[PDB]
């Protein structure tokens, strides 16, 4: 249980830390993930759309930057739910 | 480490340029004639690069130097001029 | 070799680079320490090699005035290389615009002070690269300046470094 809760805390915290950063870009043709810093060099000659190396197709920004507050809220609500478990673990650490 | 070379004096190799590096130096001179690097011996109308190389070696003005190895890793240096084409 | 991770954050608080060690070895077999150069002295020393290679090419066909220099070395560099080094013109412009001292002898006297003081090389190279005059706002700007050096001694060297430099 201790390893499970610690892995939940660390995985959700790192997921929240990543998801607080903005999205990146999506190519609907090849259906693959892209990041903003990877898309820095994906600008075209005229800075209008984000050019694709394979599809030569514009890149559109994903929908996860507003999932920052959703991951935060899930973390907080789950933390509230497991707070009796955290208190019980504290009392176990008090005990033998 | 310790400069990995030897001075041109007290060289203990043979002073006789032998067959394999003979072949190599002929082939290289064929390459310089192949891509029109300047000749040094005068022409007599022949256009064969191997003939040009043979004549240049015979008159002994080939502008190349040769490096030999030893099992340690240190190397010697020689010029083709100070060798003597004897076989 | 085993991916050689060596994860180091780069910072001014003696958080060094992975290749830019303090101690190397040189081609002669002698120990080559790290060399870092400040903005002013870099802008001074580049012109030595610039005029040296210009007179070197002049001898090849034979066989401080920064307003002059930004166009002069542009002409010299487009003479031998192409016009692609507008980036280099920008870097020398940075070298000559925000350098703490325009002249050479003030920087040289600063170096003559520093060879006797024996300060930390990277620290004082960072100090020479930056252009500030008062130690406490320098400290609040850079936490390396906050933690590495006492503010009183920092100020007592900062004033005798800042009196020489041409104010902007």
């Amino acid at each position: 249980i201790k390893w499970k809760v610690h892995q939940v805390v660390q995985r959700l915290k790192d997921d929240l830390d990543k998801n607080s950063e903005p999205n990146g870009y999506m190519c609907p043709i090849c259906l693959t993930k892209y990041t903003q810093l990877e898309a820095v060099q994906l600008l075209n000659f005229d800075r209008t759309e984000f050019l694709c190396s394979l599809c030569d197709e514009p890149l559109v920004e994903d929908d996860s930057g507003k999932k920052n507050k959703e991951k935060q809220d899930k973390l907080n609500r789950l933390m509230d739910q497991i707070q009796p478990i955290i208190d019980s673990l504290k009392k176990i650490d008090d005990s033998r | 480490l310790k400069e990995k070379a030897i001075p041109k004096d007290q060289r203990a190799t043979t002073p006789y340029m032998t067959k394999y590096e003979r072949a190599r130096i002929l082939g290289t001179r064929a390459l310089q004639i192949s891509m029109n690097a300047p000749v040094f011996v005068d022409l007599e109308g022949e256009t064969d690069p191997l003939r040009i190389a043979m004549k240049e070696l015979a008159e002994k003005k080939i502008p190349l130097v040769i490096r030999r190895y030893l099992p340690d890793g240190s190397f010697e240096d020689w010029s083709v001029e100070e060798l003597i084409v004897d076989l | 070799r085993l991916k050689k991770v060596e994860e180091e954050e780069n910072a001014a608080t003696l958080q060094l680079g992975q290749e830019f060690q303090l101690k190397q070895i040189n081609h002669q077999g002698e120990e080559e320490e790290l060399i870092a150069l400040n903005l002013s002295e870099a802008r001074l020393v580049i012109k030595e090699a610039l005029v040296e290679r210009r007179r070197a090419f002049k001898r090849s066909q034979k066989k401080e005035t920064r307003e002059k220099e930004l166009e002069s070395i542009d002409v010299l560099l487009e003479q031998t290389t192409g016009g692609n080094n507008k980036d280099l013109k920008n870097t020398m412009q940075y070298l000559t615009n925000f350098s703490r001292f325009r002249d050479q002898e003030t920087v040289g006297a600063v170096i003559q002070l520093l060879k006797s003081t024996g300060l930390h090389p990277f620290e004082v190279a960072q100090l020479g690269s930056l252009a500030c005059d008062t130690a406490d706002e320098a400290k609040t700007l850079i936490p390396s300046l906050n933690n590495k050096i006492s503010d009183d001694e920092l100020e007592r060297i900062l004033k005798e470094l800042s009196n020489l430099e041409t104010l902007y």
């Binding site: 950063e21 903005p22 | - | 780069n10 580049i46 090699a49 980036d87 870097t91 020398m92 925000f98």
Partner: protein
Amino acid sequence: MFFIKDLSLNITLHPSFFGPRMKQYLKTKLLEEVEGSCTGKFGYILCVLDYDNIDIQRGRILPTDGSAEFNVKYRAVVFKPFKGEVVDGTVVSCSQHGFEVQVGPMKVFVTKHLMPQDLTFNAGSNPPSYQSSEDVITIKSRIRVKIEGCISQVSSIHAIGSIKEDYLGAI
């Protein structure tokens, strides 16, 4: 940043150029492939130091091609990017999601989430500028920027920057 280090670099040369005056020819070669070069390891390479007494001293002919190579040890001035240093760079181009500051070799860019929200951004500007008291992109455009990381990749080097710090951004 602007640093000095001994560097050894190997260069090759076509066998048709085996004239008497090839040392200076090699020197000219060294100038054009040293100048205007940015590497991942040492950032951008500016120019060369100690033009005289340069050391080349020997070359090897390739066995299969007449080309011969030559290693050159030299002193040079280079720019080395780093993380977390306040610099007073200049801005040339700007975007709506953020201005693109040209600090020497880099084009350091600040993404829309790293500008402070108390900066009074106005969208109706040509170019779009983020000004509050005096930090306006101009012909000078001197803006205090901190590169908290320069992201070197396959060789289109970009640096990330921030002005989320007191006196940073404003001049």
